[PDB]
């Protein structure tokens, strides 16, 4: 059973592992293939919390929604359409924030 | 209530708890945030627990409809700052918070 804290730091890394790459102009397969491996890795994270973190039903569709964002990043890496990689990191990104602002509300956090 | 099914953040009623669209202080989240219990502004303005059944039992889904739209002392009002549509998903997120 992970804790809160290791959940987060398990979608921190891909987190800043995709912020790197979107805004380039690139297709590069290994950077294609490394943007999918961090978004199974996000979404691996909100599968995670689901399966040992209760706390209520609004916590768990934060995390949906951060995961209905990191699907898309993840076909859009495939279909090699950065455009769309990257409207759908700033999209997860509000998803991040939402969680953070409405359960930890006096806290500044990252992202 | 229609509850909201999980989505693109931008159509979310989470963002907008989060304060797109409000000033700080009129944002949900500034008073009952740390998960619905109410923040230390909120509770000085008297913000219930959300997360709490006692609270929960007190207002019907119609009441919290109504209680959003028209507010009620330092609970701001809402009609017309955000869609019919919107209110009813709002109204589910503060049903959510007793959920486990
Ligand atoms: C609620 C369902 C959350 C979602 C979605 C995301 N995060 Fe989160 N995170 C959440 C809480 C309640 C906290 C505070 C935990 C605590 O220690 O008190 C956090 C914290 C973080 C942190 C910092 C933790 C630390 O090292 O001290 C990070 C780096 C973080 N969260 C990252 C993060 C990202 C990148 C997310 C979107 C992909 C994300 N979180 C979503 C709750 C929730
Ligand atoms: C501080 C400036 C607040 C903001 C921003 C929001 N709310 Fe609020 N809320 C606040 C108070 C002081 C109270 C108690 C009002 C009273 O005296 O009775 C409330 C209450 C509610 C309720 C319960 C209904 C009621 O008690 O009248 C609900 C369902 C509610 N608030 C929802 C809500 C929403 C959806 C908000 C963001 C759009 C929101 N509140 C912001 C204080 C503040």
């Not at chain 2, 304060?19 to 008297?46: D, P, R, W």
């Not at chain 2, 009609?79 to 049903?95: F, L, T």
């Amino acid at each position: 059973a992970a804790t809160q804290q290791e959940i987060m730091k398990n979608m921190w890394d891909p987190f800043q592992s995709m912020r790197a790459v979107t805004g380039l102009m690139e297709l590069t397969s290994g950077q294609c293939t490394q943007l999918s491996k961090d978004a199974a890795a996000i979404l691996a994270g909100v599968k995670e919390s689901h399966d040992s973190i209760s706390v209520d039903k609004n916590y768990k569709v934060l995390n949906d929604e951060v995961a209905y964002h990191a699907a898309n990043i993840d076909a859009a890496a495939k279909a090699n359409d950065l455009e769309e990689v990257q409207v759908q990191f700033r999209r997860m990104t509000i998803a991040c924030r939402n969680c953070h602002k409405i359960y930890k509300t006096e806290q500044r956090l990252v992202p | 209530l229609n509850e909201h099914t999980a989505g693109d953040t931008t159509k979310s009623p989470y963002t907008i708890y989060a304060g797109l669209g409000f000033a700080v202080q009129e944002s949900c989240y500034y008073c009952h945030g740390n998960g619905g219990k109410g923040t230390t502004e909120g509770l000085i303005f008297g913000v219930p627990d959300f997360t709490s059944t006692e609270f929960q039992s007190s207002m019907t889904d119609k009441q919290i409809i109504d209680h959003i739209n028209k507010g009620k002392g330092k609970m701001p009002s809402y009609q017309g700052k955000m869609s019919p549509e919107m209110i009813e998903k709002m109204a589910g997120v503060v049903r959510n918070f007793a959920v486990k």
